[PDB]
Design a protein around this ligand. Structure first.
Ligand SMILES: [Cl-]
Ligand code: NA
Lengths: 238, 239
């Protein structure tokens, strides 16, 4: 339907919701990359993701979502699903491939570890959270199986980070969109939410701290928590 | 670990298992794109995905997986997760971006619909199949919720294919890796396996038929069924 009056696309617009402990694990992903690359962007706090105008941007009716001017300015582009928002930002703004990958060999590993998160840990974690908190009935056997699957995903990330010189998931030398996608679901606070001892994956914990010490990541976590708690509650932030 | 004697990487090697109705819906995806682009490749039929040598290729211990030579031909690289195998094959072999997308605009929509399948329909369908067939105990409330989530994904795809001129999921004009990734989980036979009536999503059904009519798609479906049922059951198949 008709867009809100304050929704204008002069630059990349990242769509988020009010910052809470449970609302920021996916929206933080594109924000980390925007902060890493220093991309000019606006923040739009969505009051209701069920709103018809928003389903025209993201048919899956969730944040994060992006509206942006196409390189030639002929079209308004959109990105939705948190992994797709990372792919878009990398494609449009990371022309060096510092986070997207510079060659076929780099991208091969980046896309392996990015897709592993997109297909396995990400959806498993979101099904765990749904059945644990959101489902009207509690199904403990389903929850236990999903928690078990999370430990297997942590085992895989741990095995990778135990390989000689492998400081990051995809590339030995530097973090990539694979690392950004994985971090919010592979840190101590999220491990504790799942009822897991994160010290049981030492190389994964080290990696999460290494990622956490990055200035862009610190800025992203600060800002995503604050969205919708400033002077403006909903709509285009200033 | 120790590789099997017959595993050599002289070109792209696609790792599959013995063809059944429920063993081919992810392995067929890279095979469709290989057939579309006419990429030279070998097929390796894995007997046990639990084999230590295989986990060195794919730590997730599943098919599809790819071993291939690097562009220069000095080194060997790998792709695993079906979506990743599509991204790799497009990156290495689809230089025109016929299926990968030719510009930032095309790739924005290709990645939206590809990631929707990778994150939503794909994992939901796999968890449905797991709880329905593989889990030692049948959990009908879990299976029903997953089946319900599949109908929501079908609703999203139907909405997209009801938009004016939108013949394919990502692009209006031609199919992409987004369409290839989606097809095996959005076709009549799969809809019947889930216990759904696929005619409830008319534009989605028409799209699945349009995709199914493509020669490359037919060849991949025909080939993926036969892997491990020929004169060689497991290991590197003979062309
Ligand atoms: Cl249960
Ligand atoms: Na049609």
């Amino acid at each position: 339907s008709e867009r809100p009056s304050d929704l204008v696309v002069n630059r990349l617009v990242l769509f988020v919701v009010k910052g809470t402990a449970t609302s920021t694990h996916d929206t933080v992903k594109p924000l980390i990359l925007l902060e890493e690359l220093g991309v000019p962007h606006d923040i739009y706090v969505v009051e209701k993701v069920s709103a018809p105008w928003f389903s025209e941007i993201n048919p899956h009716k969730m944040v994060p979502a992006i509206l942006d001017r196409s390189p030639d300015g002929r079209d308004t582009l959109r990105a939705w699903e948190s992994t797709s928002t990372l792919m878009y930002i990398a494609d449009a703004y990371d022309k060096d491939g510092t986070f997207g990958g510079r060659n076929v060999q780099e991208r091969s590993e980046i896309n392996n570890w990015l897709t592993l998160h997109t297909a396995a840990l990400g959806p498993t974690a979101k099904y765990w959270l749904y059945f644990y908190k959101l489902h009207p009935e509690k199904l403990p056997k389903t929850i236990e199986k999903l928690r078990s699957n999370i430990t297997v995903q942590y085992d895989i990330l741990e095995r990778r980070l135990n390989e000689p010189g492998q400081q990051y998931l995809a590339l030995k030398d530097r973090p990539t969109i694979a690392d950004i996608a994985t971090l919010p679901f592979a840190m101590k606070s999220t491990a504790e939410l799942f009822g897991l001892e994160f010290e049981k994956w030492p190389k994964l914990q080290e990696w999460s701290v290494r990622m956490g010490e990055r200035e862009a990541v610190k800025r992203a976590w600060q800002r995503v928590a604050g969205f919708g708690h400033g002077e403006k509650e909903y709509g285009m932030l200033e």
